[PDB]
Design a protein around this ligand. Structure first.
Ligand SMILES: CCCCCCCCCCCCCCCCCC(=O)OC[C@H](COP(=O)([O-])OCC(O)COP(=O)([O-])OC[C@@H](COC(=O)CCCCCCCCCCCCCCCCC)OC(=O)CCCCCCCCCCCCCCCCC)OC(=O)CCCCCCCCCCCCCCCCC
Ligand SMILES: CCCCCCCCCCCCCCCCC[C@@H](O)O[C@H](CO[C@H](O)CCCCCCCCCCCCCCC)COP(=O)(O)OCC[N+](C)(C)C
Ligand SMILES: CCCCCCCC/C=C\CCCCCCCC(=O)OC[C@H](COP(=O)(O)OCCN)OC(=O)CCCCCCC/C=C\CCCCCCCC
Lengths: 53, 446, 61, 423
């Protein structure tokens, strides 16, 4: 059922859509990081230092 | 053998020589027994004032009805008797008068064009007869939904600019235009550096230049010493015109973004992208199996009676987009499917469909350039827009350069997140609101 | 501000919905910091010393 | 210096098939298979079969599926066209030089291996109603259908469009039958532009050796006459008046073709009084409202129809017809100058030459010449043919029309339109 999706057009179709799919992941990451307050990721951010000891 | 490549080199170079007048005189030779000869003029509606809007169109009605050397009938009688055909046309940017005749009849053909173009007997009795003729043609054109929507699209896209005007002008300007109004435009525009004598067929460029000096030389003496007119840029407006008429059985919709103009190298990639989307009409036999996704979805779901893409070019500007005709209940779906294809091409154009687009375009270009009339037209227009004849091998060169990346870069440049000019006519209740149309000019996923 | 800052903000970030989103989420994180304590500092001035945060050092071990 | 132009290659094969090619060094290529299979070979039991057939050109073949024919031709940006006339069907195929092979193959499959699948034919039947509706929106189409139905009792009476009662009634077997007995070697011509003679001769020898159907180009048009009248309401009146003339190829037909230019075909000048058009000038004399008039000239394998066609206001119809008719009468009575004919010669000669100057018009002419004549006759001698027509022949052509049993079709408000009877 998956052999129909493999060929040169789909190679081009994947490459055409990858800068976008990568940038949506960056959106999701920053988005998840910002929303839960992941001080694990956010401690290393040069202005966001709300954990100001 | 003969490869497609080799064939392009075999087509002889369009030979250009210039008169002291500034009349560019050009020809493409062949072994043909016939020919087409014409004068292409750098005049149209874009040069007109608002107060003389039907002026060029009016001269076009008067040009074949008498001269100082051939009063009334005489011209017709001469052209008719040698078996020749004599035609004319006027766009917003270009006016042309051409003769299809036997190659041996080229001496009289050029002679008659000279008389038509220089010695127009604008007899006041004939201008009055033409007044009724043009007014009657205005009522005639009203019934052509396609002619209207494009005038409407021009009117709204080029809001307030000379390009917004139609070629024929408004009724009042036909009713009130005088011989003076007509002579003035004639003298200001039918000047030698804005005229190209074009020919194609069984010719000799030597013989044509001889004739051009024989009959057109007579525009020397003094030229351009008081006033010179150069075209001002025309503002494009992303706008909508909706003429709601629930008594016409099918809706006409023409939607377009601003194009770049004649000169721009990226008209090629646009044309390729247009070729991919193409054109459909209910008498096409292909239906479901058509390559263009819009054409196939149109055919399957009968979404449409006809659609066609266009890339209308003017100096430094244009109209890029599609026009369709359909039933009242199918306008929405037609827009969606059209705009979805523009976006598909903007973001995710694939390599093979771009080959098909290139292939359709090489075929179109070579099919069009068949016979003396289309080629003579191409010489005249090309010289007026590109300043030269762009040879076929150069077109092939510039076509072959377009790949998938080119299409999506170029389609995005012109289509992506750009304001359409939209013109609608007929049963248009279901025609999407401008905001909605404008929202189809981008994708939230991209 | 040569081809306008808004024009370069559009061509660099706003064009694609991806970079538009990324600008909002990156912007929402920056703004949250500059506003939370930035508005708390204004809340400090209207209550100059009447808050426990100001009293603090009066009762320290 | 252009290239010195090549010469047309011609060959009749023993089996009756004809091959003609011209290497014109064009960037594109055109191949046409012309077949004696037009509407005339339909009978009273299978009307419209050659219409649906014309519509069937991209249905499934042995060797190429429907989807392949479409996507295959579209991939290379070529065309597959089919043009029927009352005598011929013509399958034409266009593409760039490098792509002749794939399109040829498609051509051969459409014409020699069509499968006509039950459900595919079923799905295509409604295209007959659209196809017919789109043509019939020119008042001229019904007028010329009707003109033929009235002229002939026979084969040329059949219309190029399918009668309504037949739509959805044409069977997959009827088309198989039509192909097997009309698309045969001796009824065929394979014309090629931008192709080589060996290659055409090869595919002809390999793929086009079919014979097992009918023989006669003349199953035989029995000219009869009479009129058909269609009340319409319709803005203005269309009327064609016609008599039997001359079979295409004969010397007589050339006289008719000259007569047509003495009286008047289409215009030559954009928006003109048509000064040399003797029919137009004759009606104009006493009709001071919108009208049109042209000489009509139809030439076939074994018959012909010459006369005139008129467009006029409902109330002016009879005046326009009677004026046109009397104008022909004066030429039959002897009133025709030498320069009058000389101009008609020049109008015809020039027009013919212009008619073949493109590759589309060239291929069609070489095709129709191959079927009607079995020859290629160069322009140089066609012009010689025309020249041999004397003034006395053109007079004799007008004499034949005036004195010959008429045929008439007309449509509109027929209230003031005459009846042959009254002409
Ligand atoms: C896990 C499984 C994966 C899920 C995939 C399914 C996605 C389907 C859909 O939701 O996405 C559409 C949408 C695609 O839209 P598109 O590329 O412009 O074109 C689609 C068609 O043209 C759509 O047709 P159109 O041209 O007529 O578009 C107009 C329509 C207009 O719809 C309006 O937005 C609806 C507003 C209703 C609110 C009324 C309440 C009034 C108060 O806008 C869109 O379709 C988006 C609608 C969003 C609705 C909210 C979702 C709720 C669930 O996806 C967006 O990209 C999502 C981004 C936003 C989320 C943030 C990113 C986080 C990661
Ligand atoms: C129901 C009860 C609640 C009551 C709420 C009432 C108060 C009003 C607030 C409601 C929300 C309305 C939002 C305001 C409307 C603005 C439109 C917005 O949605 O943008 C759209 C598109 O949406 C955004 O682009 C998406 C950006 C995503 C930003 C992130 C949002 C924060 C959520 C965090 C995500 C992480 C998930 C959480 C993980 C835990 C369309 O943009 P548009 O104006 O047409 O511009 C076109 C785009 N161009 C420029 C590319 C052409
Ligand atoms: C688990 C529950 C979560 C609760 C936590 C709260 C989370 C915050 C809520 C998130 C809201 C996200 C809003 C995103 C909507 C956005 O995508 O819409 C885009 C759209 C773009 O418009 P176009 O120019 O036409 O573009 C398309 C043409 N190409 O812009 C919108 O109009 C404006 C945004 C309005 C927000 C509306 C969100 C409401 C959606 C909830 C649906 C509720 C309906 C109830 C029926 C339920 C049946 C499913």
């Amino acid at each position: 059922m998956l052999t129909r999706f493999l060929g040169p057009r789909y190679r081009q179709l994947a490459r055409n859509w990858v800068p976008t799919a990568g940038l949506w992941g960056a959106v999701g990451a920053v988005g998840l990081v910002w929303a839960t307050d992941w001080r694990l990721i956010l401690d290393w951010v040069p202005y966001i230092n709300g954990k100001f000891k | 053998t003969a490869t497609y490549a080799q064939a392009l080199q075999s087509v002889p170079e369009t030979q250009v020589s210039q008169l002291d007048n500034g009349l560019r005189v050009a020809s493409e030779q062949s072994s043909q027994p016939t020919c087409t000869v014409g004068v292409w003029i750098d005049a149209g509606s874009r040069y007109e004032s608002e107060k003389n809007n039907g002026a060029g169109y009016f001269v076009e009605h008067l040009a074949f009805k008498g001269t100082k050397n051939r009063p009334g009938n005489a011209l017709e009688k001469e052209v008719e008797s040698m078996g020749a055909h004599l035609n004319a046309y006027s766009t917003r940017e270009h006016t042309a008068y051409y003769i299809k005749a036997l190659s041996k009849d080229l001496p009289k053909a050029v002679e008659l064009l000279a008389d038509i173009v220089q010695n127009c007997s604008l007899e006041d009795s004939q201008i009055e007869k033409e007044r009724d003729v043009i007014l009657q043609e205005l009522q005639e054109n009203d019934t052509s939904m396609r002619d209207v929507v494009f005038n409407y699209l021009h009117a709204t896209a080029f809001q307030g600019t000379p390009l917004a005007q139609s070629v024929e002008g408004p009724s009042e300007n036909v009713r009130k235009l005088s011989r003076a109004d007509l002579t003035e435009y004639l003298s200001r525009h039918y000047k030698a550096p804005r005229m190209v004598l074009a020919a194609a067929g069984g010719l000799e460029h030597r013989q044509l230049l001889d004739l051009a000096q024989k009959h057109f030389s007579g525009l020397s003496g003094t030229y351009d010493e008081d006033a010179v007119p150069t075209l001002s840029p025309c503002r494009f407006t992303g706008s909508q015109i909706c003429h709601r008429e629930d008594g016409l059985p099918l809706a006409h919709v023409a939607i377009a973004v601003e194009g770049p103009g004649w000169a721009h190298p990226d008209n090629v990639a646009l044309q390729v992208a247009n070729a991919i989307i193409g054109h459909y009409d209910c008498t096409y036999g292909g239906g479901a199996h058509l390559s263009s996704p819009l054409a196939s979805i149109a055919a399957t779901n009968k979404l449409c009676q006809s659609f066609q893409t266009f890339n209308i070019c003017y100096a430094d500007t244009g109209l890029l987009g599609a026009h369709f005709v359909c039933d009242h209940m199918s306008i929405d779906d037609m827009m969606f499917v059209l705009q979805g294809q523009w976006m598909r091409l903007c973001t995710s154009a694939t390599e093979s469909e771009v080959l098909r687009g290139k292939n359709l375009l090489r075929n179109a270009l070579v099919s069009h350039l068949d016979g003396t009339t289309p080629v003579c037209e191409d010489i005249g227009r090309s010289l007026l827009t590109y300043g030269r004849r762009i040879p076929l091998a150069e077109w092939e060169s510039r076509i072959a350069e377009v790949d998938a990346r080119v299409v999506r870069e170029v389609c995005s440049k012109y289509f992506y997140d750009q304001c359409p000019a939209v013109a609608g006519f007929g049963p248009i209740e279901q025609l999407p609101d401008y905001n909605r149309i404008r929202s189809g000019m981008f994708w939230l996923r991209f | 501000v040569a081809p306008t800052l808004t024009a370069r903000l559009y061509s660099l970030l706003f064009r694609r919905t991806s970079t538009f989103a990324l600008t909002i989420v990156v912007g929402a994180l920056f703004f949250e910091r500059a506003f939370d304590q930035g508005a708390d500092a204004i809340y400090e001035h209207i209550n100059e010393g009447k808050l426990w945060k100001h009293i603090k050092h009066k009762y320290e071990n | 210096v252009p290239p010195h132009p090549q010469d047309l290659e011609f060959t009749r094969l023993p089996n009756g098939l004809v091959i003609a090619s011209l290497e014109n060094y064009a960037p594109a290529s055109r191949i046409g298979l012309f077949i004696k299979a037009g509407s005339r070979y339909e009978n009273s039991n299978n009307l419209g079969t050659s219409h649906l057939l014309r519509l069937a050109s991209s249905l499934t073949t042995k060797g190429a599926s429907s989807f392949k024919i479409t996507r295959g031709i579209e991939a290379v940006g070529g065309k597959l066209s089919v043009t029927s006339t009352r005598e011929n069907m013509a399958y034409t195929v266009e593409c760039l030089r490098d792509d002749v092979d794939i399109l040829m193959e498609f051509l051969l499959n459409v014409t020699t291996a069509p499968e006509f699948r039950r459900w595919e034919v079923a799905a295509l039947q409604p295209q007959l109603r659209i196809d017919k509706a789109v043509a019939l929106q020119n008042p001229q189409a019904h007028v010329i259908e009707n003109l033929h139905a009235a002229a002939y009792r026979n084969a040329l009476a059949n219309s190029l469009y399918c009668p309504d009662y037949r739509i959805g009634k044409v069977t997959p077997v009827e088309l198989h039958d039509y192909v097997q007995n009309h698309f045969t070697s001796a009824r065929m011509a394979l014309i090629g532009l931008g192709v080589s003679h060996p290659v055409l001769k090869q595919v002809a020898e390999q793929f086009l050796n079919i014979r097992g159907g009918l023989g006669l180009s003349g199953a035989k048009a029995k000219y009869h006459g009479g009129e058909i009248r269609e009340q319409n309401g319709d803005s203005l009146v269309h009327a064609a008046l016609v008599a039997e003339s001359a079979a295409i190829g004969s010397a007589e037909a050339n006289a008719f073709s000259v007569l047509q230019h003495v009286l008047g075909a289409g215009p030559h000048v954009k928006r003109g009084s048509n000064a040399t058009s003797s029919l137009y000038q004759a009606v104009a004399k006493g009709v001071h409202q919108p009208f049109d008039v042209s000489a009509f000239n139809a030439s076939y394998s074994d018959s012909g129809l010459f006369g005139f066609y008129t467009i006029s206001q409902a109330a002016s119809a009879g005046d326009v017809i009677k004026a046109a008719y009397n104008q022909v009468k004066t030429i039959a009575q002897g009133n025709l100058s030498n320069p009058d004919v000389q101009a008609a010669k020049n109008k015809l000669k020039a027009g013919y030459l212009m008619s073949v100057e493109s590759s589309e018009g060239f291929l069609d002419e070489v095709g129709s010449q191959a079927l009607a004549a079995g020859s290629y006759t160069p322009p140089s001698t066609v012009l010689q043919q025309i020249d041999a027509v004397a003034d006395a022949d053109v007079i004799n052509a007008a004499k034949k029309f005036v004195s010959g049993r008429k045929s008439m079709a007309a449509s509109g408000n027929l209230g003031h339109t005459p009846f042959i009877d009254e002409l």
